[PDB]
Design a protein around this ligand. Structure first.
Ligand code: NA
Ligand SMILES: [Zn+2]
Length: 258
């Protein structure tokens, strides 16, 4: 793709090819914890990932995605602000060149080292491609990563990154259990937003968890060794693949907790 995260094709340029970049419900945003409204009508999230089937990990030149079999209700998200059942299709991360940046959402202007996005689509629309054209088509669970202790359940991912260093490489990636990426608490903020990469469609109910997970410096270091470029092209390290916070405009962030 022509878009990317550099000086000449990065997020401040995206609106020329994707005019929705300046839309009314763009993501990410800063979550102002004192202005977020506690909504006691929000239900607990229901995450059912015991039957998840991972298939493949791939470097798509802007992040790396772990892809799941979503041809049946095997790993689903329900409850919270959602209606209906949303199936997990892929997860990926955004991270920085240094530990003090990398998350897309911020919490009272605080940046975290990275942000994990678990992407799910509304099974009433039949496939992911139809779901992205609907205002309630996707639900993305966002989880912040801070640097501290290692996360053992992430190690299987960091160990295969060597095999998908450059854009377009993929590897088999089976029997990965995404339950090892979840914090203890499922308390969350939710708001209506968009994909944070092109095509930036406004089809996302965001569900951002309050509690970060900790990963080790050595674990996030290995993310920073991947490349944006394809094999044989000049080396450009895959770092700072985050979009800056966008205006909230006419939107309220709701919290599941006080
Ligand atoms: Na993608
Ligand atoms: Zn993302």
């Amino acid at each position: 793709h022509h878009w990317g995260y550099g000086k000449h094709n990065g997020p401040e340029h995206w609106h020329k090819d994707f005019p929705i970049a300046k839309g009314e419900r763009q993501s990410p945003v800063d979550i102002d914890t004192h202005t977020a409204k506690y909504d006691p009508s929000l239900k607990p999230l229901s995450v059912s990932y015991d039957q998840a089937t991972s298939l493949r990990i791939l470097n798509n030149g802007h992040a790396f995605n772990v892809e799941f079999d979503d041809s049946q209700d095997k790993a689903v998200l329900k409850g919270g602000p959602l209606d209906g059942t949303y199936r997990l299709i892929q997860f990926h991360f955004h991270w920085g060149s240094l530990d003090g940046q990398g998350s897309e959402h911020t919490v009272d202007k605080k940046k975290y080292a990275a942000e994990l996005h678990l992407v799910h689509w509304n099974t009433k629309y039949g496939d992911f491609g139809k779901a992205v054209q609907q205002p309630d088509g996707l639900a993305v669970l966002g989880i912040f990563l801070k640097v501290g202790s290692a996360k053992p359940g992430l190690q299987k991912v960091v160990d295969v990154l060597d095999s998908i260093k450059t854009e377009g490489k993929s590897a088999d990636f089976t029997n990965f259990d995404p339950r090892g990426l979840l914090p203890e608490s499922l308390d969350y903020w939710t708001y209506p937003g968009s994909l944070t990469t092109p095509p930036l469609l406004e089809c996302v109910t965001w569900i951002v968890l309050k509690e970060p997970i900790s990963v080790s410096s050595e674990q996030v270091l290995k993310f920073r060794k991947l490349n944006f470029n394809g094999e044989g092209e000049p080396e450009e390290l895959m770092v700072d693949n985050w979009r800056p916070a966008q205006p909230l405009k006419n939107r309220q962030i709701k919290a599941s907790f006080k």
